[model samples]
Target: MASLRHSMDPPTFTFNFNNEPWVRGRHETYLCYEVERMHNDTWVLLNQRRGFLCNQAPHKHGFLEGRHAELCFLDVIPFWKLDLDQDYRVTCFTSWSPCFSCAQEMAKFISKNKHVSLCIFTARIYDDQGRCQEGLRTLAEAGAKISIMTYSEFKHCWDTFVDHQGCPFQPWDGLDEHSQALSGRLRAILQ
Candidate 1:
């Protein structure tokens, strides 16, 4: 296949973002920042707040930090959909794995809105046990068609980007939950 980008110059530029807020001790969301270079050599700052078009309060949910999906739904989705009816099925697409509570929240959202499907886009999913999470406990209960996706769609994200040679970004410190989660995912996803 040809290169994803040729010569580091992308042909066209359109920017969109997922938005969630970063709160200190409350329910926190993720933030994704991207930079774009226009053909006229102009630079665009794709901050999560403006780019993603969301409006949830920037409260901190301690465990859900810097996770894209968490950020998008928390930060931008609610804000963008403010004008829509409360019964709207909030479409949530995420890359950071979601826990059971998150999934339950999605289900509840769907339940409130005439039991319609709350669309969810997840890159990878995990149960409360940290194993891959899939199937329908919520949709079945709520009579909705929630779109729960997973990295099961493709395996190449891990195949291309992981580095096992030397030091990694996270280290197991025994007490840090983040460290344990990272280590667990790496161990399972990688050989």
Candidate 2:
């Protein structure tokens, strides 16, 4: 039987992991994001970017993982010089959801850019210290839509986002456990 699978509407762009420092199995926490905006009836790709968490001021100044992709996104926004005159919906695909500080930053950005609406999809949650909870809450309050990446979405990213192809996505053995834990945490925080 022919598979009924169809392409995602408002097409998603790949992460283009070329010389990417982070890869699965590596202990390093890495993140990548794709930005798209609606054009007429279709979504147009703006850009894709990535970064690793590092030992930075926000992270207790311990160099614990480093800069987040969310911060990187903020850094690059000025260069994009996007037009803010029209109402635009912005979608981001990321390896990990924004942490507390990044969430706060994103919230601020979204608040300032009243013409822009933000949506985020991530393969996993990045909360530690329950700050992710707070950050996400802030973003939601600011009208940002955040969600965990589904299996199909993960495949879409693996096939389209990364530079090195031919490699198939292997389901993480702990997907269910991790997702359940995060979902519970989110509920706890929200309540």
Candidate 3:
């Protein structure tokens, strides 16, 4: 569908992932971290009994209506459709990580929209004491829009043992937090 550019409120939504019901093989811890990290404490705070939508099927079915709805979480696929504005700006507030699929999604969205900017959120590098660095430099080097609190970063902030040892982790593991952060940042970009 062509984007609604007529200054529609465009549904104020929050990017989230499955947390309560515990979808097996799917972890939503990143969403938890995003909520805690961005704790201005303004969220509606829906519980698991509320039933979060898993796919776009619900949206097409009239479940997503008007500007009154706020999505708790969604993976990269459906969120791409939410980008009805074609804004290049992205936020990593939920459990979303940029992969070939999401990258392509953003690329296509931008192509269709023509004026998009990209922002990236990554692990916050820490000092030897496990304290956050004065400023993030590595992301500047990587050319990512910005780095958000990553699994390791957040774990490190708590001064816990590093877990990159048991099994090497991939970017997808941190998508929930990344996407959510990106959502908030997107608003900032428009301002």
Q: Number of the top candidate by lDDT?
A: 2
RMSD of each: 14.4, 9.6, 16.2
How many residue pairs of model 3 clash at the backbone? 30
Candidate 1 global lDDT: 0.33
TM-score of 1: 0.34
Candidate 3, 91-151: lDDT as tens digits: 3332333323333444444345433333444331112132122122222223335455545
Q: Choose 1 or 3, whichever is better by TM-score.
A: 1
* Model 2 alpha-carbon drift over 4 Å, by segment: 1-28, 47-66, 184-191
Candidate 3 C-alpha error for residue 148, in Å: 3.8
How would you order the candidates by lDDT, starting with the best?
2, 1, 3
Measured with C-alpha atoms, the lDDT of residue 2 in candidate 1 is 11
Off by over 4 Å in 1: 1-78, 81-90, 115-117, 130-136, 143-191
lDDT of prediction 2: 0.57
List lDDT for all candidates, in order.
0.33, 0.57, 0.31
Instruction: Tell how far residue 18 is off in model 2, in angstroms.
Output: 19
Q: What is the TM-score of each predicted model, taking all chains together?
A: 0.34, 0.65, 0.26
